[PDB]
Amino acid sequence: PNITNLCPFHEVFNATTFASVYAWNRKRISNCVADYSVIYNFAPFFAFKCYGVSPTKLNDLCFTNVYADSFVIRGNEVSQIAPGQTGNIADYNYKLPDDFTGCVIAWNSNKLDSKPSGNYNYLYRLFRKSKLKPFERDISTEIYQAGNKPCNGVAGSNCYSPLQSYGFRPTYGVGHQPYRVVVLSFELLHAPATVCGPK
Amino acid sequence: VLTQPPSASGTPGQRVTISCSGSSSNIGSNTVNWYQQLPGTAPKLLIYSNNQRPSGVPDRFSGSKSGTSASLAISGLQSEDEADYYCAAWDDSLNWVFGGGTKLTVLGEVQLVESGGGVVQPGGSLRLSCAASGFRFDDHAMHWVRQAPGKGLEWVSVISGDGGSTYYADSVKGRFSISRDDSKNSLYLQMNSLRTEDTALYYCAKDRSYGPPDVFNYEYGMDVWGQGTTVTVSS
Amino acid sequence: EIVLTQSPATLSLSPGERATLSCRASQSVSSYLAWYQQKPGQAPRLLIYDASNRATGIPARFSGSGSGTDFTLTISSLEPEDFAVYYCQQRSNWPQYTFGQGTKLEIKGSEVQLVESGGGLVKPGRSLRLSCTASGFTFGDYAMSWFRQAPGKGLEWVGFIRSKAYGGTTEYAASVKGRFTISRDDSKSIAYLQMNSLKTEDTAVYYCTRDRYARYDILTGLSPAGADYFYYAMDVWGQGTTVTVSS
């Protein structure tokens, strides 16, 4: 009931460039009164799952830090963005913790991220030697070695670049179309509350 | 279970409201879908995502989801708005729960065809197939909604476009098996050990989303229905 | 630039014997040598890959060795039907396969399949259009390379299209650049090859082959010496079309 300066949710949900899945562009939503009713006026969403909290009771809760990471993911891979899920884009690109307290918002972007010849600017990691820890990020493009012969930094017959493209085309059926995902998180570990509701 | 007034009424020209309450597991966490079924026809989707309507539904129908309850506002009802309106939500217990039906009584292309029915010798089995033509079958999900004669809608099974996930109701779990064939454009439902309480029409409902309603909990809705196959399992 | 030269030219060894085949290399290439066998008329078949590992199906009498700038194929057993031309192939330059003039050995002195189409006289209407339809492996997770073989001249490189994963880009050779264009139709699982501005020297037998498996996840646990590694990550040649010329 004392809204002063709403958080820039329109700078997170309504943006022209969304990063790849191995990048996050995490934004610290802080030092501003958060009105969680503005998220419903940006676009028609296709997935809205709040793990731990309630979408209606989000307005009357205080937190120490709210984060908002965004990335473009395939349609068949939205089901992997969930606490305790295994998969290609859930073990090597984005691992949500099993104690996740937040919301995962996903919506289609076929009219903005699909050119007739396919857009190869959205890259995804296929495999690593290990699995990512919760909330970890890898931008290293070290060439993979699928064989017994060492690879001296050149993509060859057995040496592979770790990042592959999606190739989003408008003719692909629903499932291979771009889906922009904005995962909201909340922290209350040890800090004063600075991100409250309209109050 | 979604509680709903069993019968509402109104005069032609006034706006009536049909409420539908629910727990924090179905409406509070997911979206509400309102349907309309004239006497002797198949249901049609009115409002999805609690505030959105397809092209066919006029603007007179309004929706609103305030907390864990929903409301269907029919502004200026005509003589043709005399039917039973149902609510729909996806409970987090992996089941599609319907309402009870509200008999609104006034005081004044894509084709889904299904076959396979008859007496089932209550303890036998029966095969149900649903033909499909003209909506990119591999992209939309499929459903199975049966309705006893004179009763409400009951959800049976669901299968996503990929076919990986498949959910069943608690009363048809372990006895029914759903499947799809993307090459033949057909939806199958194998019924085994049919009991005396499985007499219904078994509509074949085509969903508008791709994934199951658990992952896409803000887009699901049964757009195109079909003419059900009245099974008559009896002695 | 890496020229591979075979030392023997025509081995007339009788069966019940041995056989030796050498191969030099200008630049020091690692264990990226693949020996091919080509019966007259048929398509090349891979005998040894990685210069030490044998294929899945061929007899064990093909032990090859060598690494660096000198390789050796030693058929140290009898030659029942070893009458064929034995080529070599380097893969140091991954998109630039270069072969070598093979040796002609004489006697004395499978659901994966990709067929081709398009051929005949081309001098009138100097624009051909080839095709290559796959029927086994899931077309889309592999790159597709093209090779041509002039009449009694040996194998050559044309170009290739990378898989949808690593960009749909292309990389042609020097003699087919600016004229030959390769494109894919992954929805229909068919690869194409345009032949605009046809010349007289393009009268070869063209082949479409597979390339590296874009999915290195499955290629991790597999040892690069077994039958499962050969089935997923290795070239699968097809039949051959023809192009002609006139006045």
Q: Hey, where are the domains in chain B? A: 9-106, 111-223
Q: What DSSP letter does each residue of B131-151 carry, written as one string?
A: EEESS-TTTS-EEEEEE-TTS
In a domain, C241, yes or no: no
Q: Which residues of A69-84 are buried (b: 16+ CB within 10 A; e: fewer)?
A: bbbbbbbbbbbbbbbe
Contacts of B49 in chain A (CB under 8 A): 44
A133 alpha-carbon distance from chain centroid: 15
Nearest C-alpha in A relative to C211 = A157
A44 and B49: CB-CB below 8 Å? Answer: yes
Q: Are B141 and B210 within 8 A, CB to CB?
A: yes
Q: Which of B182, B178, B181 is nearest to B138 (CA)?
A: B182
Domain boundary among C71, C105, C139: C105
Domain boundary among C56, C78, C105: C105
- To the nearest 10°, report the CA torsion of B191, B195, B201, B207: -50
Q: What is the CATH number of the domain that holds C27?
A: 2.60.40.10
* Residue with token string 């179905």: B26
SS3 C100: strand
The CATH number for B111-223, chosen from 3.40.720.10, 2.60.40.10, 3.40.50.720, 2.120.10.70, is: 2.60.40.10
- What Cα–Cα distance (Å) separates residue C193 from each residue in B118, B213, C93? 57, 44, 22
C80 torsion bin: left (phi>0), alpha (psi -120 to 50), beta (else): alpha
**How far apart (Å, rounded) are the C-alpha atoms in residues B152 and B35?**
12
In a domain, A1, yes or no: no
CA A131-A136-A140 angle, to 5 degrees, is: 80
* Residue with token string 């290559």: C132
A79 and B28: CB-CB below 8 Å? Answer: no
A75 and B210: CB-CB below 8 Å? Answer: yes
Which residues contact residue B229 at a Cβ distance below 8 angstroms, ignoring those fewer than 6 apart?
B114, B115, B116, B117, B128, B201, B202
In a domain, A84, yes or no: yes
B9-106 in CATH: which number?
2.60.40.10
For residue A55, give its domain range. Answer: 9-133+164-187
Q: Are C242 and C150 within 8 A, CB to CB?
A: no
**How far apart (Å, rounded) are the C-alpha atoms in residues A131 and A136?**
10
Q: Are C217 and C232 within 8 A, CB to CB?
A: no
C111 alpha-carbon distance from chain centroid: 19
The technique by which this structure was obtained is cryo-EM
In a domain, C244, yes or no: no
Q: What is the CATH number of the domain that holds A60?
A: 3.30.70.1840
Q: Are B57 and B72 within 8 A, CB to CB?
A: no
**How far apart (Å, rounded) are the C-alpha atoms in residues A102 and A105?**
10
Bridge partners for B44 per DSSP: B36
Site from C27, C31, C90, C166 to mutate, A interface, most A CB atoms within 10 angstroms = C166
**How far apart (Å, rounded) are the C-alpha atoms in residues C153 and C84?**
14
**How far apart (Å, rounded) are the C-alpha atoms in residues C2 and B162?**
48
Q: Which of B94, B41, B80, B85 is nearest to B62 (CA)?
A: B85
**How far apart (Å, rounded) are the C-alpha atoms in residues C54 and C64?**
8
- What Cα–Cα distance (Å) separates residue C159 from each residue in C53, C100, C112, C176, C215? 26, 17, 22, 8, 21
A161 and C166: CB-CB below 8 Å? Answer: yes
Site from C67, C163, C217 to mutate, A interface, most A CB atoms within 10 angstroms = C217
R_g of chain B computed on alpha carbons: 17
A158 and C212: CB-CB below 8 Å? Answer: yes
Resolution number, Å: 2.5
Domain count, chain A: 1
C40 in the same domain as C95 = yes
**How far apart (Å, rounded) are the C-alpha atoms in residues A78 and A89?**
9
A164 and C165: CB-CB below 8 Å? Answer: yes
Q: Is the dihedral of CA C146, C149, C154, C156 positive or negative?
A: negative
User: Of the candidates B162, B209, B219, which has its C-beta nearest A76's C-beta?
Assistant: B162
Q: Are A155 and A145 within 8 A, CB to CB?
A: no
Cβ contacts from A onto B, under 8 A: 48
B217 touches chain A (CB under 8 A): yes
In a domain, A148, yes or no: no
B202 torsion bin: left (phi>0), alpha (psi -120 to 50), beta (else): left
**How far apart (Å, rounded) are the C-alpha atoms in residues A157 and A138?**
24
Q: Is the dihedral of CA C219, C222, C223, C226 positive or negative?
A: negative
H/E run at residue B221: none
B215 touches chain A (CB under 8 A): yes
In a domain, A2, yes or no: no
C94 and A156: CB-CB below 8 Å? Answer: yes
For residue C177, give its domain range. Answer: 114-232
Going by beta carbons, is chain C in contact with chain B, meaning 3 or more pairs sit under 8 Å apart? no
